[PDB]
Amino acid sequence: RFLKVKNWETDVVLTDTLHLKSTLETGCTEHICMGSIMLPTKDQLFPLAKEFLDQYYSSIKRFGSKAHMDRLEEVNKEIESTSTYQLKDTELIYGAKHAWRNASRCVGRIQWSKLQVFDARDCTTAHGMFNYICNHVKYATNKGNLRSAITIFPQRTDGKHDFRVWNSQLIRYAGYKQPDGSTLGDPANVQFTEICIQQGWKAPRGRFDVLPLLLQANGNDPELFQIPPELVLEVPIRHPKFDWFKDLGLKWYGLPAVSNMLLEIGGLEFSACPFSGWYMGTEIGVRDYCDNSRYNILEEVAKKMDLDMRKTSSLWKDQALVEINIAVLYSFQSDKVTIVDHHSATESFIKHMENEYRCRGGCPADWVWIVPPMSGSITPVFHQEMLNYRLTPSFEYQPDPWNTHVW
Amino acid sequence: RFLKVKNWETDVVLTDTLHLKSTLETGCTEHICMGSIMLPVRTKDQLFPLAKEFLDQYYSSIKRFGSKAHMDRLEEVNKEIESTSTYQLKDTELIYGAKHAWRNASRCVGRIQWSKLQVFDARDCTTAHGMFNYICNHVKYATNKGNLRSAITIFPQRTDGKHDFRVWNSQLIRYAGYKQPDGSTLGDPANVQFTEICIQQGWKAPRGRFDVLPLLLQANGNDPELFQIPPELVLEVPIRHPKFDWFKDLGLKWYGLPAVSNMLLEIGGLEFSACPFSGWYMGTEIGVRDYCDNSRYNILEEVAKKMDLDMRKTSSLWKDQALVEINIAVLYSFQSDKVTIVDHHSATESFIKHMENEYRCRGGCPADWVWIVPPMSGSITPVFHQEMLNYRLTPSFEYQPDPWNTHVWKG
Numbered sequence: 001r002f003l004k005v006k007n008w009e010t011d012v013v014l015t016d017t018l019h020l021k022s023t024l025e026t027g028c029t030e031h032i033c034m035g036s037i038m039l040p041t042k043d044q045l046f047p048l049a050k051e052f053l054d055q056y057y058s059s060i061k062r063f064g065s066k067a068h069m070d071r072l073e074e075v076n077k078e079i080e081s082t083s084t085y086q087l088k089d090t091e092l093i094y095g096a097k098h099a100w101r102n103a104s105r106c107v108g109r110i111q112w113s114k115l116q117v118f119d120a121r122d123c124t125t126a127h128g129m130f131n132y133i134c135n136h137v138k139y140a141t142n143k144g145n146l147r148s149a150i151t152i153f154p155q156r157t158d159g160k161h162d163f164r165v166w167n168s169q170l171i172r173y174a175g176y177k178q179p180d181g182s183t184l185g186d187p188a189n190v191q192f193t194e195i196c197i198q199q200g201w202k203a204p205r206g207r208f209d210v211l212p213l214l215l216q217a218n219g220n221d222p223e224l225f226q227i228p229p230e231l232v233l234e235v236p237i238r239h240p241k242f243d244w245f246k247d248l249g250l251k252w253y254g255l256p257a258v259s260n261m262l263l264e265i266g267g268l269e270f271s272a273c274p275f276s277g278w279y280m281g282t283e284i285g286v287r288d289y290c291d292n293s294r295y296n297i298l299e300e301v302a303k304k305m306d307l308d309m310r311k312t313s314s315l316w317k318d319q320a321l322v323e324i325n326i327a328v329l330y331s332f333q334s335d336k337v338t339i340v341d342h343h344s345a346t347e348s349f350i351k352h353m354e355n356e357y358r359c360r361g362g363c364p365a366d367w368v369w370i371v372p373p374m375s376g377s378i379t380p381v382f383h384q385e386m387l388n389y390r391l392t393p394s395f396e397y398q399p400d401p402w403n404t405h406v407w
Numbered sequence: 408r409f410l411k412v413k414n415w416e417t418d419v420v421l422t423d424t425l426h427l428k429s430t431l432e433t434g435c436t437e438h439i440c441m442g443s444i445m446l447p448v449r450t451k452d453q454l455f456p457l458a459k460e461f462l463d464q465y466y467s468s469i470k471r472f473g474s475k476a477h478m479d480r481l482e483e484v485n486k487e488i489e490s491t492s493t494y495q496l497k498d499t500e501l502i503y504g505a506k507h508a509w510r511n512a513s514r515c516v517g518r519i520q521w522s523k524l525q526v527f528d529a530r531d532c533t534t535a536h537g538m539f540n541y542i543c544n545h546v547k548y549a550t551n552k553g554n555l556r557s558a559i560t561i562f563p564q565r566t567d568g569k570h571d572f573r574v575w576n577s578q579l580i581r582y583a584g585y586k587q588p589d590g591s592t593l594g595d596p597a598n599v600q601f602t603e604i605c606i607q608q609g610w611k612a613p614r615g616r617f618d619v620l621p622l623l624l625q626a627n628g629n630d631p632e633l634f635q636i637p638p639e640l641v642l643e644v645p646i647r648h649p650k651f652d653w654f655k656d657l658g659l660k661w662y663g664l665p666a667v668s669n670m671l672l673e674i675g676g677l678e679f680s681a682c683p684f685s686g687w688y689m690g691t692e693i694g695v696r697d698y699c700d701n702s703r704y705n706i707l708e709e710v711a712k713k714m715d716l717d718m719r720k721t722s723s724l725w726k727d728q729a730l731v732e733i734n735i736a737v738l739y740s741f742q743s744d745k746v747t748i749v750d751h752h753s754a755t756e757s758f759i760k761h762m763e764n765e766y767r768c769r770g771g772c773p774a775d776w777v778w779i780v781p782p783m784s785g786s787i788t789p790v791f792h793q794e795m796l797n798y799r800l801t802p803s804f805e806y807q808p809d810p811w812n813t814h815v816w817k818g
């Protein structure tokens with residue numbers, strides 16, 4: 001019931017009790033571990049509301065105070081009557097920060113309590129959503145000095161009136177499958193790029209075309225909007241030693257802003273809740289550039305490096321991978337856009353884990369996601385046992401809106 | 408129940424039914440995942456069903472399930488268990504069992520090779536001197552002058568738990584570690600505790616950085632005894648780099664034969680506490696873990712210095728750059744010396760094909776992602792993008808406690 005996790009590099013042992021408040025389910029059973037699988041009513045709501053308000057009033061040292069019991073009563077009445085309820089701003093801010101705090105796949109959680117929350121619950125149209133999103137982008141970008149932020153649109157009601165950002169992130173590059181047969185731009189978004197075009201977007205038809213936003217208010221059909229390019233901070237990618245590198249023509253955007261997730265607070269569902277922080281360098285240089293299904297440039301870079309590409313055992317993929325990643329880090333740093341390297345982010349996370357064990361009794365952590373996609377064992381997280389369990393408030397996946405929306 | 412796994416690079420979907428034959432536990436539940444936790448005497452009572460399960464499997468594999476040979480063997484084993492409280496495997500069953508334990512090893516990326524395993528039956532062994540002799544023959548046969556051949560040597564099974572056969576070494580060939588009075592370590596930090604046991608037991612330690620440890624062998628529950636493996640039997644590779652000439656001057660070498668000797672082999676409920684097995688190395692095992700772990704030889708800094716990387720900020724990725732060079736060096740040295748090694752691209756690719764084949768022919772392939780994904784360059788290997796299901800089949804290899812922790816000294 002009280003579980004230990006060991007670091008094998010340092011022998012440090014931490015004791016986890018926090019998991020015993022695990023509300024949701026993992027995918028795993030006594031018989032089968034699913035640790036590597038990507039995705040394994042009025043009276044439903046009151047338990048959920050109560051559990052949440054209990055931890056809220058607990059966090060501000062007021063558990064079992066008149067104000068506590070009075071708020072339980074009030075929410076109880078509102079549910080009983082309206083079949084939902086509204087969070088106070090304070091509860092909203094706390095819930096959002098905790099959804100991030102509880103994100104077991106997130107290495108960047110040392111930062112969890114410095115989160116700017118933009119309350120967009122009064123939003124009614126896609127234009128209003130667009131306004132809110134531009135403001136969020138400008139605020140978070142902050143001329144390169146990135147600041148974490150979330151903008152929270154109205155909660156689900158009867159589930160026919162959902163707010164959705166159809167983009168998977170606010171800022172992504174377009175994907176076009178060509179008469180050629182290959183893929184121009186980013187193949188991850190080919191489907192979304194066509195949904196945009198079939199909706200009316202005019203594609204500059206290049207390799208790094210910032211996609212238009214595609215926004216759905218109150219259950220209506222989504223609308224297209226171009227983010228002011230002055231709001232979209234981009235970084236040309238160059239190497240501190242290879243001058244031919246620039247000629248590959250690589251760029252990336254400064255602001256990662258996840259916009260397809262569902263935020264659950266006290267049983268309430270926020271289906272549009274775009275949030276942003278900043279990149280760990282390997283996200284761009286390992287995954288975005290080098291995944292076979294992505295910009296897949298390893299082969300191109302290895303050539304320019306004139307590595308021996310004759311045999312996998314020369315480790316040419318590996319040598320290139322590193323250079324690409326030194327470049328990404330160098331470029332962002334040079335242009336003074338916030339980025340973190342995987343060494344630094346993982347050391348931060350170990351420090352964060354320690355804090356959370358000490359101050360909270362634990363820290364849900366998904367090793368499969370926390371270990372960076374390169375250089376795993378030379379980062380301290382590789383040697384750290386983690387326990388993964390699901391706490392609420394949380395961020396959850398939700399189906400792509402096109403697979404649900406009725407026109 | 409039918410379970411699906413997807414590969415996110417290829418969209419290939421596989422269906423697992425094999426997980427339904429899974430007996431043992433994972434550590435996980437509906438409410439917690441222990442997927443990254445390194446480690447999460449039987450009566451007749453429990454022995455009967457385990458023996459039967461195993462013999463049903465064995466008799467299915469040979470296409471004789473429900474045969475008279477199948478039933479007779481069931482009766483015979485059953486009679487032996489209630490007469491003697493245990494039983495003996497036939498040679499054929501032992502061989503099949505050891506093969507299947509390997510095939511069922513979900514942390515093993517090398518399983519494409521599972522069916523080519525040389526099994527050495529050391530069940531007539533009675534003394535530590537006998538064990539030394541078996542282990543020398545295994546080392547020589549496996550090494551095969553650099554052209555490595557997989558093998559396992561199976562010493563007698565557990566009886567009452569007071570008569571265990573154990574190899575105290577964690578692998579047959581491993582380098583000494585010595586903690587110095589100044590807090591630093593000479594040789595391999597992973598082996599300090601074992602090295603000290605050896606010295607205590609009377610080993611005269613050369614006290615250098617690459618001293619091959621003596622075998623420490625326990626027969627029949629007796630106190631263990633020390634033996635030196637003949638040096639002529641220990642194949643080693645000096646480490647050099649194909650472009651970096653100062654690399655040899657780092658003074659590194661490694662042994663060619665990885666041979667694990669501290670695991671427990673479980674077959675039909677029988678427990679084989681000494682079952683050293685060997686194959687060959689994946690390059691990263693030496694180049695990433697053995698040399699570059701902070702708690703191991705930890706040569707990353709010295710290598711980085713000599714490459715003259717900028718070591719003042721981690722975001723230079725100097726650690727990453729040096730790691731790759733060390734690993735290129737390991738593969739180059741082994742290949743140049745004609746000692747079998749496999750790089751992590753080639754091994755993980757083979758594993759993916761093995762895995763798809765296993766889904767087709769067997770209905771599944773238990774696989775531990777945490778262990779199967781290499782310790783460098785994860786996402787540029789096809790296993791990183793492969794969803795895997797982890798579950799436990801027998802026959803199996805299991806952990807067991809280090810014997811110095813449980814042994815009753817006879818004196």
Ligand code: HEM
Nearest residue numbers: 100103105106107108111148275276277278279280340395
């Ligand atoms: C402050 C800078 C931040 C850094 C460096 C950081 C780092 C990361 C990284 C590297 C991943 C894995 C992503 C992938 O492989 O696609 C991740 C996942 C995640 N992060 Fe953080 N993060 C940061 C801020 C945040 C913020 C502000 C939130 C929410 C408020 C958050 C919530 C999550 C969630 C929900 C996931 C998992 C997404 C999924 O499961 O697909 N992150 N983060």
Ligand code: HEM
Nearest residue numbers: 509512514515516517520557558684685686687688689804
């Ligand atoms: C034939 C060449 C082979 C290669 C390249 C190979 C590769 C590997 C590698 C890289 C690991 C991870 C080890 C670590 O990180 O320490 C591993 C684990 C394992 N392998 Fe294989 N292997 C091979 C043959 C075998 C054989 C012959 C057996 C048994 C007959 C075996 C059984 C296992 C087991 C039980 C583990 C898990 C160890 C543990 O849980 O600590 N391997 N193998």
Ligand SMILES: N=C(Nc1cccc(OCCOc2cccc(NC(=N)c3cccs3)c2)c1)c1cccs1
Nearest residue numbers: 168188256257258275276277278279280293415416
């Ligand atoms: N990239 C793919 N798909 C895909 C398509 C569209 C979006 C997408 O995003 C994955 C989620 O990305 C995240 C999630 C959380 C955090 C981050 N990275 C960040 N640093 C932050 C985002 C927001 C705050 S921090 C990125 C992934 C695929 C490759 C191979 C098969 S599918």
Ligand SMILES: N=C(Nc1cccc(OCCOc2cccc(NC(=N)c3cccs3)c2)c1)c1cccs1
Nearest residue numbers: 008009577597665666667684685686687688689702
């Ligand atoms: N390396 C450590 N300890 C340690 C000591 C002695 C042995 C040891 O080995 C770990 C397991 O080793 C394996 C297991 C299975 C396969 C392999 N590698 C192989 N290619 C094969 C070995 C035998 C057949 S194939 C290595 C690990 C530690 C570092 C930090 C904390 S503990």
Ligand SMILES: C[C@H](O)[C@H](O)[C@H]1CNc2nc(N)[nH]c(=O)c2N1
Nearest residue numbers: 382383384385443444445777778
């Ligand atoms: C805590 C974690 O499970 C531990 O450090 C693991 C991670 N993955 C591993 N994978 C392999 N192949 N070998 C290992 O020793 C480890 N160590």
Ligand SMILES: C[C@H](O)[C@H](O)[C@H]1CNc2nc(N)[nH]c(=O)c2N1
Nearest residue numbers: 036037038368369791792793794
């Ligand atoms: C199948 C496997 O779980 C999947 O490829 C995961 C592995 N670990 C990951 N880790 C991170 N951080 N991001 C990812 O997209 C993935 N992909």
Ligand SMILES: [Zn+2]
Nearest residue numbers: 028033435440
């Ligand atoms: Zn699990």
